[PDB]
């Protein structure tokens, strides 16, 4: 029978009445999806900052954030302590389509984030003079219907991300995506509590009580949280999850996945970091 999540009530998107489940809601999900949704800003703004300075320093924190999630351990655990015990294990990409080596995680936990563009290497990120070129180096010319690599790694549609030179708002959003083979309320609550203790979010009102089961057939700026941030995954492409799992030879044809509520994170960066992150050749380039 399907897993009983007592505290979070279930919810269904395509048809499946629940008489209390006869209609496609039978087995365990292919995987649970956990989004750590990050909003970041260089809160004290100055003149003389270039458009790139809007996002380079916020993006530089993805590496420490990814390390925190992967090294997080639930002290005083009654069943699961670390992420390795709970996350989805992937082994090898398809034998063809190895061109995405060192851009998608090969061995270990399925964990996606912008840092994958630089192999989760802060030094490689620092030695990069044009973040936009690196980000777009593998997008198609709109000739491929599946989800693009940028969408897969960022977790957002792309216009919400704010990573562009014409960003008028100084708040940039991205996401870290975790695929979990098992559901553990204690561990997930521990991870959520840790992230909101480290990075409290301003009057964050995100919903936290519904798991969505999806079945696939066939001046100074301030960070705000609102209804536009609720269920952000719903604004990804339809083929997003099937294409993500197809890259690893996992099929969602007659089975479903379970998307959990997102964990909010808010990062405020100061001019000292915004400068220390700056690449020397962009100071005299424009």
């Amino acid at each position, epitope marked *: 029978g399907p897993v009983e999540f007592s*505290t979070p009530v279930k919810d269904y998107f395509p048809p499946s009445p629940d008489v209390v489940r006869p209609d496609w809601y039978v087995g365990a999900p292919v995987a649970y999806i956990q989004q750590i949704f990050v909003k970041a800003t260089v809160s004290p703004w100055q003149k003389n900052f270039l458009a790139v300075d809007v996002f380079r320093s916020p993006l530089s924190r993805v590496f420490q954030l990814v390390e925190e999630i992967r090294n997080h351990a639930l002290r005083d655990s009654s069943g699961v302590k670390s992420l390795e015990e709970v996350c989805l294990q992937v082994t090898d990409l398809l034998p063809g389509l190895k061109k995405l080596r060192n851009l998608l995680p090969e061995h270990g936990c399925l964990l996606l984030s912008p840092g994958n563009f630089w192999q989760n290497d802060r030094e490689r990120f620092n030695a990069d003079p044009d973040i936009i070129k690196t980000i777009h180096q593998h997008e198609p010319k709109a000739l491929q219907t599946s989800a693009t690599l940028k969408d897969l790694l960022f977790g957002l549609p792309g216009k919400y991300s704010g990573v562009n030179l014409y960003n008028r708002k100084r708040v940039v959003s991205y996401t870290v995506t975790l695929g979990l083979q098992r559901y553990d309320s204690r561990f997930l609550s521990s991870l959520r509590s840790r992230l909101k203790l480290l990075h409290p979010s301003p009057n964050c009102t995100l919903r936290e009580d519904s798991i969505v089961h999806v079945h696939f057939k066939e001046t100074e700026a301030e960070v705000t949280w609102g209804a536009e941030d609720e269920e952000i995954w719903r604004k990804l492409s339809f083929r997003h999850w099937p294409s993500l799992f197809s890259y690893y030879n996992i099929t969602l044809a007659k089975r479903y996945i379970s998307i959990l509520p997102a964990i909010p994170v808010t990062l405020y960066l100061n001019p000292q970091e915004a400068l220390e992150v700056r690449h020397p050749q962009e100071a005299n380039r424009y």
Partner: antibody
Amino acid sequence: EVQLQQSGAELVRPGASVKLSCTASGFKIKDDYIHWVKQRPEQGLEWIGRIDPANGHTRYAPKFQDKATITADTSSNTAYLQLSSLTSEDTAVYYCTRYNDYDAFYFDYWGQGTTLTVSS
Amino acid sequence: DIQMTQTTSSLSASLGDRVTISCRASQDIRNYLNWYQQKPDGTVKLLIYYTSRLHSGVPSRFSGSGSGTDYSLTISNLEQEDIATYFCQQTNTLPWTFGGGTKVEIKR
């Protein structure tokens, strides 16, 4: 709202065994750990152990290994602490509590406390 | 394993006075310090679970600060209801240890 009623004061002989009880109201013990703490005047609070009533998985401080035994009945929503091989050093106040945040691990709600005296 | 020590076991103050309790950990505890209040009746109540934060229902006159090994609770203006003992608990390494409480009393 949330209350943790404890049993009355207890008097027992040395070498005996006691079973203290802690009944929850306003919440289900399945949803949280239940902890026992020991207060002794002039020595300060100290942690005994905890139980996860959903799993029945207990853990103790190394001081009380082989001393304390924690159990829980979900139907009655009640946790229990059993003390064995009692001695004078066990005369103290025992608090039942829980926590609700699983990274901070703060004890949000406490019982009033049960005084246990061991004398012949 | 981790020993927490409060410098003063007693402290005398007056209504409306600025009060500060402090305690030190034997090793880094990574800001995992909670502050509890015990009344003379004996009932305990959480004040500052996390460094600097506040448990719901606690008056805003309570505050917390500190880092590394040294942490401090502060009462901006001592009220008559704030006569009690205060304990600091470390939740960093698994056997949680409390510090010997510090009592706060009025000036006799």
